[PDB]
């Protein structure tokens, strides 16, 4: 006896996912409505007429057993019912594989012709015949609950116009997460790949998460948001596993933007639920090192990190190649503070005795979060007193609440 030799190269599934399949019609150029586009479209139409006539002729004299509805009706007969869901363990040959049922028992079965052989990889969910356990299909895995959590289904309502004073900060983030997607020609004509990674660092409340919210609002790519504290897991290896799985979902939904908010919280915070101590966090860090810049080729995945403590990060994590741009978010100055106050009071109904200039110097170390909290609390004071107009006394009592006590 000799071992069977597969004809397919490798044991992984085809990288391409969700294509147009048989409808991959050519990109006829130009899009302008002129003669050669009409001429080009006619050629596509002509061959379809040839294709339509040829296929009809064959099926016309094909046997009654061999028909498009009959063969599909037959396919159900070979599959049978129910269709047991198993797990692919190993691909022994082109038409042979080892599968395991939910009971933990493995069977050496035969892969039928109608199964999509390009979707077969070990660990994938396969559909097996109830009687003979033969592979009769591949179950498209439903979206994991972990996939749904990262993905931001609805873009946040915060836009770049809602950000005040971060003109340079907004500009830098666009060239790494927005400009490469909207205008890739600028990079290609220049011969440089876009800046790989970006990190937003500064004092708390400076607008780091807000700029990512603005980025997520005006992006055509899938946005995945993960807090650094979410990467601390209860069991050994799940920390690295979650980081590995987070960047796998990003690769599936390419192009994608991965926002690792509060990245420093993975190390600056110690929890007893994390079985391994600082050593398990380091292994999680090393896994994140591989994902940002490692052996595996990276698709159109852009990484945004935010932290108010950049001195506590591993310098190897934010090294160039992993995080190219380090955008600083300073505390707002006088011009920015007035802009932030006008931004958060635009929908307000201010009184004639309320001046924003006095509120600018509420505190020397005033941040955007403090300004928004001052306004939000000031409106709450008016809501308590059953009013729609916010007075200076309402703002005065606002400062003593959020800033003090």
């Amino acid at each position: 006896y000799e071992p069977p030799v597969p004809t397919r190269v490798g044991k992984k599934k085809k990288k391409t996912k969700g294509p147009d399949a048989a409808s991959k019609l050519p990109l006829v150029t130009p899009h302008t409505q002129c003669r050669l586009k009409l001429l080009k479209l006619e050629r596509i139409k002509d061959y379809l007429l040839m294709e339509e006539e040829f296929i009809r002729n064959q099926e016309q004299m094909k046997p009654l057993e061999e028909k498009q509805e009959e063969e599909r009706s037959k396919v159900d007969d070979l599959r049978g019912t129910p269709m047991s869901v198993g797990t692919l363990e190993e691909i022994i040959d082109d038409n042979h594989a080892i599968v395991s049922t939910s009971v933990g028992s493995e069977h050496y079965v035969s892969i039928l012709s109608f199964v999509d052989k390009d979707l077969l990889e070990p660990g994938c969910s396969v559909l097996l015949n109830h009687k003979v356990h033969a592979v009769i299909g591949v179950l498209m895995d439903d979206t994991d609950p972990l996939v749904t959590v990262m993905k931001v289904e609805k873009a946040p309502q915060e836009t770049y116009a809602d950000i005040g004073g971060l003109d340079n900060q907004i500009q830098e983030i666009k060239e790494s997460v927005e400009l490469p997607l909207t205008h890739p020609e600028y990079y290609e004509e220049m011969g440089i790949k876009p800046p790989k990674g970006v990190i937003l660092y500064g004092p708390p409340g400076t607008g780091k998460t807000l700029l990512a919210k603005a980025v997520a609002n005006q992006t055509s790519a899938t946005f995945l948001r993960v807090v650094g504290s979410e990467l601390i897991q209860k069991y050994l290896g799940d920390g690295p596993k979650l980081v590995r799985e987070l960047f796998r979902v990003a690769e599936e939904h390419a192009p994608s933007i991965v926002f690792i908010d509060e990245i420093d919280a993975i190390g600056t915070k110690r929890y007893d639920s994390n079985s391994g101590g600082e050593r398990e966090i380091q292994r999680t860090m090393l896994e994140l090192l591989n994902q940002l810049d490692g052996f595996d080729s990276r698709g159109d995945v852009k990484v945004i990190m935010a932290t108010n403590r950049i001195e506590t990060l591993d310098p190897a994590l934010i090294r160039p190649g992993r995080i190219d741009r380090k955008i600083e978010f300073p505390l707002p100055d006088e011009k920015t503070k007035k802009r932030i106050f006008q931004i958060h009071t635009s929908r307000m109904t201010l009184a004639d005795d309320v001046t924003l200039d006095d509120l600018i110097m509420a505190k020397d170390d005033l941040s955007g979060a403090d300004i928004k909290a001052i306004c939000t609390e000031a409106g709450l004071m008016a809501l308590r007193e059953r009013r729609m107009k916010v007075t200076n006394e309402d703002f005065k009592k606002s400062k003593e609440n959020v800033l003090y006590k």
């Binding site: 019912t81 129910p82 269709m83 009971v103 439903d142």
Partner: protein
């Protein structure tokens, strides 16, 4: 009374018909296919009765 007697004799044959599994629907699929989880026996892709 005749219906009660007739239903009683037919019940004995009916009670010998094998019972039905209890499963949990994961998601519905095309061609009236449903992914279920039989309680001890893992997942299945099952048909849907015409009713």
């Amino acid at each position: 009374l005749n219906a009660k007697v007739r239903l009683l004799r037919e019940e004995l044959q009916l009670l010998q018909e094998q019972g039905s599994y209890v499963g949990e629907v994961v998601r519905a699929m095309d061609k009236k296919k449903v992914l279920v989880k039989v309680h001890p026996e893992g997942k299945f892709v099952v048909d849907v009765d015409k009713n």
